[PDB]
UniProtKB/Swiss-Prot annotation, chains A, B:
Present with 11600 molecules/cell in log phase SD medium. The lineage of its organism: Eukaryota, Fungi, Dikarya, Ascomycota, Saccharomycotina. It comes from Saccharomyces cerevisiae (strain ATCC 204508 / S288c) (Baker's yeast). Belongs to the ALAD family. This is Delta-aminolevulinic acid dehydratase. Catalyzes an early step in the biosynthesis of tetrapyrroles. Binds two molecules of 5-aminolevulinate per subunit, each at a distinct site, and catalyzes their condensation to form porphobilinogen. It comes from the Eukaryota. The chain holds residues 1 to 49 of 342 of the full protein. Homooctamer.
Amino acid sequence: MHTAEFLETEPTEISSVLAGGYNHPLLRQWQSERQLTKNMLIFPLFISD
Amino acid sequence: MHTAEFLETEPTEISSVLAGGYNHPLLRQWQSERQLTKNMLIFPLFISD
């Protein structure tokens, strides 16, 4: 039978662990360097004669 | 009479001129590296037993 091989691995290094930062939708917001607000938006208008 | 003395000065250097960046309230918003949104706020609660 081909079976599921699992290698022997060492304890988790703290340096490896990023997951605590984005496990919840509010944190995925928190991770943004800046949020999208209405006053950031500029809308083009084409004026005809 | 003491009168209002005005010194002779040279033409404006472009490097001196910052005013075009914040003459309107929308620009003073634009100048922020990031805007204040509701989801940035964390409120402390003191729970009693």
